[PDB]
């Protein structure tokens, strides 16, 4: 497929970088990030969806608020739940709370969820190139916690489904002097990494990034 892609360049399709605070809710920022882009790509509307709703309400889908979750599961939740409210009506508190979802306030909806075949990074490249930014999970080690900039490459991480522990959003890809990489949006604030983003080597299922990826197909 194309040599490089970047949804931020194509238009106003990628929302600003957010911060999960001290709650392990990255899976929710990866979910909203994917859905915000999908809705903007399909309708041109740029919304900011409530991650707190997922933290307080998605337990029926094997999610655990500040203790973890998976984007595919959160996409299914939004789907059956019939909607997710905006950030302005269900504010991010950053802590496990009681669900306050109001059906009349839902602004974004999911029709279906596409789950990338386990470990199929090429398929992930196609999804990013052709359809939407992709949510994925990978194993973060101490090596990565020292990251400042550049193409992250490591020998310490594993590529197995039971090792992935952080959820992020692939917004594009490219290569530099033969080294292919992914442009990834994080939710640790804009002061982390490269203005809130990071590059990671592509083509090696680096840290298991292709083990559990998914993207939503919105109901618009």
């Amino acid at each position: 497929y194309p040599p490089s892609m970047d949804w931020r360049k194509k238009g106003n399709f990628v929302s600003p970088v957010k911060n999960q605070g001290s709650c392990g809710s990255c899976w929710t920022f990866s979910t909203t990030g994917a859905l915000e882009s999908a809705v903007a790509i399909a309708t041109g509307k740029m919304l900011s969806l409530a991650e707190q709703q997922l933290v307080d309400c998605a337990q029926n889908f094997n999610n655990h608020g500040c203790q973890g979750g998976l984007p595919s599961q959160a996409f299914e939740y939004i789907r059956y739940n019939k909607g997710i409210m905006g950030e302005d009506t269900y504010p991010y508190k950053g802590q496990d709370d009681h669900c306050k979802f109001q059906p009349d306030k839902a602004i974004a909806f999911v029709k279906d969820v596409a789950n990338i075949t386990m470990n199929d990074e090429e398929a992930m490249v196609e999804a990013v190139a052709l359809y939407n930014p992709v949510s994925f999970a990978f194993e973060v080690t101490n090596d990565f916690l020292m990251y400042r900039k550049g193409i992250y490459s490591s020998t310490s991480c594993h590529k197995t489904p039971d090792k992935v522990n952080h959820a992020v959003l692939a917004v594009g890809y490219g290569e530099e002097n033969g080294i292919p990489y992914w442009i990834v949006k994080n939710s640790w604030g804009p002061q982390w990494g490269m203005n809130g983003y990071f590059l990671i080597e592509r083509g090696k299922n680096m840290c298991g990034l292709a083990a559990c990826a998914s993207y939503p197909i919105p109901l618009v």
Binding site: H64, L70, S72, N115, V164, C212
Partner: peptide, 8 residues
Amino acid sequence: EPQNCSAT
């Protein structure tokens, strides 16, 4: 088949 992933 769904994603049986560790909680990320």
